[PDB]
């Protein structure tokens, strides 16, 4: 994965959004296209809607989710089974 | 081929025993162009054969070959709705070629740990006419005898 020397990657717009939400209080789910952004400890307790390409999927950040990209919790491809 | 312009290729004699016959055998035993590996196996096998035989390696090799060598073979010929196996005399060079090939095949099929051991045991069995390679020669002769009419 990303080098440790480089540190964790997050999109600046998301970082600002998270900080604004934390200060404000409980907020309506944040809408982001930044699937690549890593989930941070500050995000815990905030619902972030991540784009799957066709729609934003609401994701409630938890402690376990920290250290993972937001994209992992939103599925891009839809499969309901072959000949199902 | 149709042109029949094929010519013989020179074969260097085996270094140790100075035999072109043994050099051919190495080439038959050789796999993936690894002549040195093949040469080591042949020389090891011959030594083991010589100790048990109490004869020179080349002499012992020749005795094994003599038993395995086939005088006559059958070539298939299609006549009408059936195919006829036709007995044909084997040329002296081919006799040697078939014998060596059969011994190598026989050695490989044996369950001894090393190829050198497998080869030596097969060569010894060939000398006493108990080898699987000798059985092939017997089978080839038997088939030819049956088809003698053709």
């Amino acid at each position: 994965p990303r080098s440790l020397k480089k540190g964790p990657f997050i999109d600046l717009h998301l970082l600002k959004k998270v900080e604004k939400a934390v200060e404000s209080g409980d907020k309506k789910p944040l809408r982001t296209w930044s699937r690549r952004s890593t989930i941070f400890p500050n995000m815990i307790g905030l619902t972030i809607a991540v784009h799957n390409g066709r729609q934003h999927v609401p994701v409630f950040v938890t402690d376990e989710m920290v250290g993972h990209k937001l994209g992992e919790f939103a599925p891009t491809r839809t499969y309901r089974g072959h000949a199902a | 081929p149709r042109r029949r312009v094929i010519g013989q290729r020179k074969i260097l004699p085996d270094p140790k025993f100075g035999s072109e016959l043994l050099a051919k055998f190495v080439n038959i035993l050789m796999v993936d162009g690894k002549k040195s590996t093949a040469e080591s196996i042949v020389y090891s096998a011959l030594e083991t054969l010589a100790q048990r035989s109490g004869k020179s390696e080349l002499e012992a090799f020749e005795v094994a070959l003599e038993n395995v060598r086939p005088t006559v073979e059958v070539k298939s010929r299609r006549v009408g709705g059936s195919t006829y196996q036709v007995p044909v005399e084997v040329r002296p060079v081919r006799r040697n070629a078939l014998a060596m090939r059969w011994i190598v095949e026989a050695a490989r099929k044996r369950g001894d740990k090393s190829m050198a051991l497998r080869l030596a045991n097969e060569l010894s069995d060939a000398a006493e006419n108990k080898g699987t390679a000798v059985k092939k020669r017997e089978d080839v002769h038997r088939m030819a005898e049956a088809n003698k009419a053709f």
Partner: protein, 100 residues
């Protein structure tokens, strides 16, 4: 290629030249072990702000005559089809059919 596709490439080359110095500096700050973690963090965020087209990676080599995105040769700056045509006409110096 389409005229737009050729236009896109020109923009990407232009932006890369504009921010070449800035990008190099920022990347150096992140690379340096001695640099403070705060300094690195600020640099990372700044590099994101810079236009994506500024990145040299975004630029894709195209045939200069046709703008073809595949079969490019760096030596001639042309795709295989145009290289062949020029080679036959003798427009490419020193280039001939090779047999060995």
């Amino acid at each position: 290629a389409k005229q737009s596709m050729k236009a896109r490439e020109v923009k990407r080359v232009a932006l890369a030249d504009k921010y070449f110095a800035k990008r190099a500096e920022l990347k150096a700050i992140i690379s340096d072990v001695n640099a403070s973690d705060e300094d690195r963090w600020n640099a990372v965020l700044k590099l994101q702000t810079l236009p994506r087209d500024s990145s040299p990676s975004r630029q894709r080599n195209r045939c200069r005559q046709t703008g073809r995105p595949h079969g490019f040769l760096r030596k001639f700056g042309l795709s295989r089809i145009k290289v062949r045509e020029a080679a036959m006409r003798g427009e490419i110096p020193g280039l001939k059919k090779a047999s060995w």
